């Protein structure tokens, strides 16, 4: 699957629709370990510690759930040590070092990975 690294810092809400607006796509949906590794190389040069991906924590009270924004199925993950509970907000972010995911609050301003 294709994907591009935007280097401008925007909130999750902003960042999703910039993909849909400027490049007409969605946030990246990762379904295997390889696509996750490729994305780690592309971002290994960023001084930023994290980047947004298409991870949105849905669910009601005590019903915390995960789901991609582009609708695809949730059939793979690569969480970090000490994740993803008891910390963070409802938007997932990939840690540039190692390639480990880590929940974060959506309104944080970080670069992102669009998929096209």
Residue in this structure with the two tokens 């096209």, named with its chain if needed: 116
CA 47, CA 94: separation in Å to the nearest integer?
Answer: 14
Backbone angles phi, psi at 102, to 5 degrees: -170, 115
- First-to-last C-alpha distance (Å) of the chain: 8
Quick check: 17 and 53 in contact, CB under 8 A?
A: no
Residue 54, helix vs strand vs coil: strand
Q: Report the candidate in 65, 67, 78 with the shortest Cα–Cα distance to residue 32.
A: 78
Report whether the peptide linkage leading into residue 84 is cis, meaning its omega lies within 30 degrees of zero.
yes
What is the token pair recorded at 19?
């993909």
71 CA to centre of own chain: 14
Q: Tell which CATH architecture fits domain 4-115.
A: Roll (3.10)
- Write a three-state SS string for the chain: CCCEEEEEEECHHHHHHHHHHHHCCEECCCCCHHHHHHHHHHHCCCCCCEEEEEEEEECCCCCCEEEECCCCCCCCCCECCCCCCCCCCCEEEEECCCCCEEEECCCCCEEEEEEC
- Sorted by where each begins, the domain ranges of the chain are 4-115
């Amino acid at each position: 699957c294709r994907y591009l690294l935007v280097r401008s810092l925007q909130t999750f809400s902003q960042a999703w629709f910039t993909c849909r607006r400027c490049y007409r796509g969605n946030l990246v949906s990762i379904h295997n370990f390889n696509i996750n590794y490729r994305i780690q190389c592309s971002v290994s040069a960023l001084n930023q510690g994290q980047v947004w991906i298409g991870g949105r924590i849905t669910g009601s009270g005590r019903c915390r759930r995960f789901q991609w924004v582009d609708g695809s199925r949730w059939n793979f993950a690569y969480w970090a040590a000490h994740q993803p509970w008891s910390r963070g907000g409802h938007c997932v972010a990939l840690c540039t070092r190692g390639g480990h995911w880590r929940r974060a609050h959506c309104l944080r301003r970080l670069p992102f990975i669009c998929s096209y």
